[PDB]
C-alpha cells in the first residue's frame, strides 16, 4: 500500500518462529508420522498446509494437541516439508523427490506440488 515496507520483516519473523520451534517455545501440537513425532505451532501449519488449515479451522479439532497422520506418510518427506514451512527452503533431491511430492499432495501444499512437477521435468 502507501505505508513503509520492511522487505526483510516477513523472513525475519519466520526465522524467529523456527527458533521458537527449535526450543519448543509455545509449540502446541505433536504430529505423529509412523514411528516419529514432530512438534510445531498450529498457526504455522495452518498458514502453510491446506490439510492442517482444514483440520484446525474447524472448532471440532481446533484444540487437538496430537494429530496422527496417515501411516503411509514417511517421516523423511514430512520433515523436509515441515522445515520448508519454517524456512522457505525446500530440500528436493533425486533420492527424495517422489516421497516429498506425494507428501505435499497429502498436506495440500499446492505451490510445493507445482515446484516438484518442475523438478521431475528438469531432471
Ligand X SMILES: CC(=O)Nc1cc(Nc2cc(NC3CC3)n3ncc(C#N)c3n2)ccc1N1CC[C@@H](N(C)C)C1
92 binds, among a copy of itself, ligand X, none (CB under 5 to 8 A by kind): a copy of itself
Say if CB 55 and CB 20 are below 8 A apart. Answer: no
Under the criterion CB under 6 A, does residue 119 sit at the interface with ligand X? Answer: no
Pick from 53, 96, 99, 113: which binds ligand X (CB under 6 A)?
53
Breaks in the chain after residues, C-to-N cutoff 2.5 Å: none
Record the cell numbers describing residue 84, joined without a space. Answer: 520448508
What's the sign of the alpha-carbon dihedral 50, 80, 18, 88? negative
Distance CA 71, CA 24 (A): 25
Pick from 4, 60, 66, 122: which binds a copy of itself (CB under 8 A)?
4
Listed ranges 2-10, 15-23, 34-42, 76-84: which one lies at the site for ligand X (CB under 6 A): 15-23
Distance CA 118, CA 1 (A): 32
Under the criterion CB under 6 A, does residue 30 sit at the interface with ligand X? Answer: no
Number of residues counted as binding ligand X (CB under 6 A)? 13
CB-CB neighbours of 77 under 10 Å: 21
By CB under 6 A, name the binding residues for ligand X: 16, 19-20, 23, 46-50, 53-54, 108, 110
List contacts with a copy of itself (CB under 8 A): 1, 3-7, 9-14, 16-17, 20, 25-26, 28, 41-44, 46-48, 56-57, 62, 84-85, 87-92, 111, 115
Amino acid at each position: 500500500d502507501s505505508q513503509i515496507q520492511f522487505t526483510r520483516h516477513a523472513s525475519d519473523v519466520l526465522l524467529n518462529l523456527n527458533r521458537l520451534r527449535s526450543r519448543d517455545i509455545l509449540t502446541d501440537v505433536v504430529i505423529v508420522v509412523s514411528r516419529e513425532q514432530f512438534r510445531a505451532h498450529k498457526t504455522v501449519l495452518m498458514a502453510c498446509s491446506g490439510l492442517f488449515y482444514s483440520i484446525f479451522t474447524d472448532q471440532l479439532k481446533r484444540n487437538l494437541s496430537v494429530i496422527n497422520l496417515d501411516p503411509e506418510i514417511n517421516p523423511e518427506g514430512f520433515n523436509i516439508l515441515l522445515d520448508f514451512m519454517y524456512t522457505s527452503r525446500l530440500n528436493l533431491r533425486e533420492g527424495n523427490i517422489m516421497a516429498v511430492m506425494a507428501t505435499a499432495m497429502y498436506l495440500q501444499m499446492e505451490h510445493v506440488v507445482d515446484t516438484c512437477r518442475k523438478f521431475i521435468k528438469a531432471s
